[PDB]
Amino acid sequence: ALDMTTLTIMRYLPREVDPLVYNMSHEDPGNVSYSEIGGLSEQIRELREVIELPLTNPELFQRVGIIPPKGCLLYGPPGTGKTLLARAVASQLDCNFLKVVSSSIVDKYIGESARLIREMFNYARDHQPCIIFMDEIDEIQRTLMELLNQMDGFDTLHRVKMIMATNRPDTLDPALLRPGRLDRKIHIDLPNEQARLDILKIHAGPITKHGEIDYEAIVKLSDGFNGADLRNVCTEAGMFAIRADHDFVVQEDFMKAVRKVADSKKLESK
């Protein structure tokens, strides 16, 4: 700030963020880590060590003299699960994880990303628990090599942690996956029946009924239903209770929901 006439420097003012980056800060402590999700217990074990152990005793790997290890690369099909897992583990300890949105756009984003992340990592330094989650991706190679080279190269950052999420196998980038930055690779897979049962029951939690439900038949009938698909069938059963101005959902409403939703899945399979 400058005086009106003498043009002298009265005071400095803080500097903020460009839009969209400002928007992308959100948090959800409600989902307990490895708990309030459906119940993906198979992958539950792996996630905790990679992140918590570095920050709980970095001095150990400094005893062995190794560069700090980093969070894992997540690989899935729908994209639903990765978000919940990151939110849940952030909820357990992290105060406010800052997540960023990833998408496929062609060119001139090297500075747009670089200064963005530099300053966001400063913001992560502001409060130590911060985790800089990166969303699923899918000119390019410039920004990829710039990110890898800079952010981890001038890093020096004592308490900030990283997680990267991507679907499908993308263009060749070993230098990103080389040991110490993206060492641990996970492969989420489509929902098993018995985990599906817990998930759909959790969604059925608020829905009214009279105990007549036969979940085992419902499971045996259809498959391929990710968590969003289960949310869909539960909602459609609610809609089939709205049909004819009924009050309490009946098992046949669940049957009708299964039928219709699985049809709308098969139809327009694109």
Partner: protein
């Protein structure tokens, strides 16, 4: 994002001016409710049915959702 009225030379605030004087008049015509009737539409009967389900019933029967325990779109 509040609008405000300010002094020309000194930029001190003088009035909040909360009175709505925002944007331009559009869509704010009370001249007529639209005039289309469903009888004017061919074929898309299932689409209007799904639309009535998705909007018309929530607009009047929110309580059916509340006491059923569901949130409408």
């Amino acid at each position: 994002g509040d609008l405000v009225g300010v002094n020309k030379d000194s930029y001190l605030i003088l009035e909040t001016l909360p009175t709505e004087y925002d944007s331009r008049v559009k869509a704010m015509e009370v001249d007529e409710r639209p005039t289309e009737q469903y009888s004017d539409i061919g074929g898309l009967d299932k689409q209007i049915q799904e639309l009535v389900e998705a909007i018309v019933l929530p607009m009047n029967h929110k309580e059916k959702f509340e006491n059923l325990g569901i949130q409408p779109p």
